[PDB]
Structure 1
């Protein structure tokens, strides 16, 4: 077990606002904006056998793709929030990952984005602190 709350946002504003939203929730944000940084820390998610509460922010959709492939081989639980201005990117990118059964949400509102993260953390929290089977 170890849950990676995946968030792709187009705004750096959202990255820091989410850091505060999840500061009191115990979800360690990892901001990935370089391919090397991806290939270093994602291997650590596999090599550290600890059941740790992690949140991955990556504003680079290519690094997100690579991330989710890596995650799928490991079978870690993901809750995905996509925030893109252009819905020809947002919708098509979404439905690729949504066809894989991932919890994928769209957003264009900054405040609403933060609230969708609160869903993700509470639902992941029910897996983290063992509730009844859902």
Structure 2
């Protein structure tokens, strides 16, 4: 089993703070800031099974929205966490992702995002009942 957590932040300084946390936990940092980069990454994740679970950072919603569906085909734990200066932009994206039926978190402060990054590190180790439809 492998878990994929997607972070959405436009705050450059936070992106680096997250990377520090992810290196402290031992998770694999990969940056996506381009539409061609994400479809490369999805294959790398599929080809390599037995190693640490990956943390993807991005600033663009159109990228993330692809990967929520792609990773869902690949057969992994999808997780979404988003924070930005525009609260209006956070909530309008999130409500659509809840309508897709995905675990998506929303925060205002960068500190709250860092909490949920650390929370994921234990919450990702869930009892994955593989026969997942009861």
TM-score range, shorter chain: 0.7 to 0.9
| Matched length | 134
Unaligned runs of 5+ in 2: none
Cα drift, residue 112 of structure 1 = 1.8
Q: 1:23 to 1:129 in 2, by over 3 A?
A: farther
Cα drift, residue 125 of structure 1 = 3.6
Q: Is the 8 A contact 2:2 2:53 kept in 1?
A: yes
Q: Is the 8 A contact 1:26 1:53 kept in 2?
A: no
Name the Cα RMSD after superposition: 3.2
Deviates more, 1:16-25 or 1:86-95: 86-95
Deviates more, 1:92-101 or 1:109-118: 92-101
Q: TM-score, normalised by structure 2?
A: 0.85
Cα drift, residue 49 of structure 1 = 3.2
Cα drift, residue 58 of structure 1 = 1.0
Q: TM-score, normalised by structure 1?
A: 0.85
Cα drift, residue 31 of structure 1 = 0.6
Cα drift, residue 72 of structure 1 = 1.5
Cα drift, residue 19 of structure 1 = 0.8
